[PDB]
Amino acid sequence: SLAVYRRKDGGPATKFWESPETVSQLDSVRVWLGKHYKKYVHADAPTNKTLAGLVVQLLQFQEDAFGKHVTNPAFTKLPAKCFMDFKAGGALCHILGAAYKYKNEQGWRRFDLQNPSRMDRNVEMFMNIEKTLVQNNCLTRPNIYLIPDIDLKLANKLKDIIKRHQGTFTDEKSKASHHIYPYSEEWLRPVMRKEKQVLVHWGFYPDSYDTWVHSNDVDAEIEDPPIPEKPWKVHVKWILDTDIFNEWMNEEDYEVDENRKPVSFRQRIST
């Protein structure tokens, strides 16, 4: 099976971030930072490759501090998709901007993420990054409605998980981002192409486990992702698996219709 390639942890795909093409994609991020976070990046005047290296350090830090292997993590992982938004003014801009702003406000001389002596204030930096993403409408954490058929004990467990992962829950279905239904294999979905490589998403793994594999190992085309339609209809394992990975899972893997039947908007490819 192709799962021999599957990432064993949700740390950064270092080869992607060191690619010359990825470094060149950060040019517009660098330029945008020099205007909209000018007070906080002028000192360091970071290059495209320095920014790529900082992304790797930030991604490695949150996997080390908040990944699946951690018991009692102090924070929930930021969505991997946030780091892949290279548009001027997008999520990566605000992640890097917030990081440099926080460093400046704390008087740090350098970022020190690989250093175990420096985790409690690095955790606070990630809480600040998440606040900045929410405030700039790059990130919305789930506001969840539980369908009435979910029984009391299971609902109680789900509410605990939701709250511990920066989510909220509501009794007003029309205001919810997600509707959760009762739950009634080994597959992947290709999601991005770059030269002769394809990024694949593994079913029931979070996006930080997405893995770059050879294009000729996936005989399927990348289908367009679903257009966001409020609300997502997913079954309870979307929340239960979020607690395993300390990372909100991908709704597409858990989607159902209003009669709880599984929905696969994009085709699932057996591994």
Residue numbers in the entry: 27 to 210, 216 to 302
The authors write:
Residues 27–383 of BAF155 were expressed and purified, and their structure determined using X-ray crystallography. Residues 4–160 form a four-helix-bundle that resembles the MarR-like helix-turn-helix domain10 based on structure homology analysis using VAST:11 43 aligned residues, RMSD for CA atoms of 1.9, score 5.1, P-value = 0.0005 for the highest scoring protein. Residues 169–287 consist of a BRCT domain with a chromodomain (residues 219–246) inserted between the second and third strands of the canonical fold. Helix 2 that forms part of a phosphate-binding site in many BRCT domains is missing. The individual domains are linked via a network of hydrogen bonds to form a single structural unit in which a highly conserved stretch of amino acids in the α3-α4 loop and α4 of the BRCT domain plays a central role. Analysis of the sequence of human chromodomains shows that the BAF155 domain clusters with so-called “chromobarrel domains”. This sub family of chromodomains have an additional N-terminal strand that precedes the chromodomain fold: the BAF155 chromodomain does have a chromobarrel fold, but in this case the residues located at the C-terminus of the module form the additional strand. Residues 28–33 pack onto the chromodomain, and a main-chain to main-chain hydrogen bond is formed between Leu28 and Ile300 linking the N- and C-termini of the module. The N-terminal residues interact with a region of the chromodomain that in others forms an aromatic cage that binds to methylated lysines. The architecture of the fold produces a cleft containing two deep pockets at the interface between the domains. Analysis of the sequence conservation using ConSurf17 reveals two highly conserved regions on the surface of the module: the first on the MarR-like domain and the second within this cleft.
